[PDB]
Structures are given as structure tokens and as C-alpha cells.
Design an enzyme around this catalytic site. Structure first.
Site, short mmCIF file in Angstrom:
data_model
loop_
_atom_site.label_atom_id
_atom_site.label_comp_id
_atom_site.label_asym_id
_atom_site.label_seq_id
_atom_site.Cartn_x
_atom_site.Cartn_y
_atom_site.Cartn_z
N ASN A 41 0.77 -1.07 0.01
CA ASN A 41 0.01 0.04 -0.01
C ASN A 41 0.92 1.46 0.00
OD1 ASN A 41 -2.58 -1.45 0.43
ND2 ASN A 41 -1.69 -2.17 2.24
N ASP B 157 0.59 4.38 2.46
CA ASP B 157 0.78 4.56 3.82
C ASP B 157 1.95 3.78 4.39
OD1 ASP B 157 -0.45 1.79 4.19
OD2 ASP B 157 -1.13 2.24 6.25
N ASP C 293 -0.06 -5.78 2.93
CA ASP C 293 -0.91 -6.77 3.49
C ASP C 293 -0.21 -8.28 3.08
OD1 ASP C 293 -2.91 -5.10 3.92
OD2 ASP C 293 -3.37 -4.78 1.82
N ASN D 224 -2.66 -6.79 7.50
CA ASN D 224 -1.91 -5.62 7.18
C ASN D 224 -0.70 -5.33 8.32
OD1 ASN D 224 -1.68 -2.26 7.76
ND2 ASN D 224 -1.81 -3.08 5.77
#
Length: 130
Positions: A46, A49, A53, A60
Site C-alpha cells: 500500500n 501508507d 497486506d 496488514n
């Protein structure tokens, strides 16, 4: 490893997931299906941020497992994110149980809300002997 539907159903049942904290086996199956397609080595970075995952349940790194590269992250399952990439899913199941002990329960996963909540999930365990 990429599990076949029914084998995963029995694997999850042997691991104590059927009805864990009120969550049916069919719900867990719907979650794994939509999260990774039953793939234990599935990963999703991701970029927004800086979290990742991991595994069959796409857990996460910001709050559940430690990968050493997610800023200000915690490790609530007290596991290396590597443990969530094993063919054997015992550690992943232990962490998934930990996730659901929190307030949201099965709702912790947005995908469960999108593809499983208020849906007919019987099709996931039919014919599996569970």
C-alpha cells in the site's frame, strides 16, 4: 500454497475457526477467497501508507505483524509478517483470531463488508464435509 476450496474449509475447521467468536466457517471462506483467492503467499503493498497486506487473509503490517519497514507500526499478533507467508496456515489463523477479538470482529476486513456481509455464503462450504 494456493488451497482448493474444500481442503481449505477442512483445514480451517481443524484449526478451530468454525464459529470462532460467532463467525461461521462460510464467512472465513468468503474472506480468504476475496482477500487472496486462497493464496498463502499473496501480498499487497500500500504505497499511500507504506504498509503491506500478507497471506491468505491479507493481514496488514501497520497493526498486526512486524516487517520492520512500516512506520510507527505495531505487532498485535506478535509475529513476523513472514509467518503469514507460510504454506501452513496455523500462524495466520492465530493472527486472524486475534484480529477478530477486537471490537469490529469480522468487519475488520473491508473486503468482508463488500463481498460477504449480508450475502449468501453457503456456496463456500457446500460439499466439503464441514
Amino acid at each position: 500454497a494456493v488451497f482448493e476450496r474444500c481442503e481449505l474449509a477442512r483445514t480451517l475447521k481443524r484449526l478451530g475457526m468454525d464459529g470462532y467468536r460467532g463467525i461461521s466457517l462460510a464467512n472465513w471462506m468468503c474472506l480468504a477467497k476475496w482477500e487472496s483467492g486462497y493464496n498463502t503467499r499473496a501480498t499487497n503493498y500500500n504505497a499511500g501508507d507504506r504498509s503491506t497486506d500478507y497471506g491468505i487473509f491479507q493481514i496488514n503490517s501497520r497493526y498486526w505483524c512486524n516487517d520492520g519497514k512500516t512506520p510507527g507500526a505495531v505487532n498485535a499478533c506478535h509475529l513476523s509478517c513472514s509467518a503469514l507467508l507460510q504454506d501452513n496456515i496455523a500462524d495466520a489463523v492465530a493472527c486472524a483470531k486475534r484480529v477478530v477479538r477486537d471490537p469490529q470482529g469480522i468487519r475488520a476486513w473491508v473486503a468482508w463488508r463488500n463481498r460477504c456481509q449480508n450475502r449468501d455464503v453457503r456456496q463456500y462450504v457446500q460439499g466439503c464435509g464441514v
